[PDB]
Amino acid sequence: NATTFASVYAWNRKRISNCVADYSVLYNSTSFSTFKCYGVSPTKLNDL
Amino acid sequence: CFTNVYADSFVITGDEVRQIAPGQTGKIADYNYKLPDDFTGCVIAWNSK
Numbered sequence A: 001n002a003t004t005f006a007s008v009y010a011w012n013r014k015r016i017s018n019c020v021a022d023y024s025v026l027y028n029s030t031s032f033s034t035f036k037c038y039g040v041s042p043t044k045l046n047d048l
Numbered sequence B: 001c002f003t004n005v006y007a008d009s010f011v012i013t014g015d016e017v018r019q020i021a022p023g024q025t026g027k028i029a030d031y032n033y034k035l036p037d038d039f040t041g042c043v044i045a046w047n048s049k
């Protein structure tokens, strides 16, 4: 939830250090049209 | 030919229809519907605006 995102050609990688990854907070905040995980299952993201 | 059939009809938004697959997570797949792992069925969806 930011004012501006990067352009696709200047795509601005950033890292996420010590914090708890709880995707539950975005349930009424945003609606995701695509959510595809590779090498991991979406139902195991809470146990990892 | 099938020996038993069920329906399970409801209404969600268009962005959440992807969450009605077996191994999905999200607001609907976590707190609302939650299909099982060995489903053996078909999932039908269509816009109804």
Ligand SMILES: *[C@@H]1O[C@H](CO)[C@@H](O)[C@H](O)[C@H]1NC(C)=O
Residues within 6 Å of the ligand: A028, A029
């Ligand atoms: C969540 O979304 C609903 C629907 O727009 C809104 O009424 C509510 O204020 C939002 N926040 C919370 C904490 O429910």
Ligand SMILES: *[C@@H]1O[C@H](CO)[C@@H](O)[C@H](O)[C@H]1NC(C)=O
Residues within 6 Å of the ligand: A001, A029
């Ligand atoms: C997202 O950005 C909006 C800016 O309009 C802000 O009002 C809101 O508090 C931010 N956070 C959430 C969870 O919506």
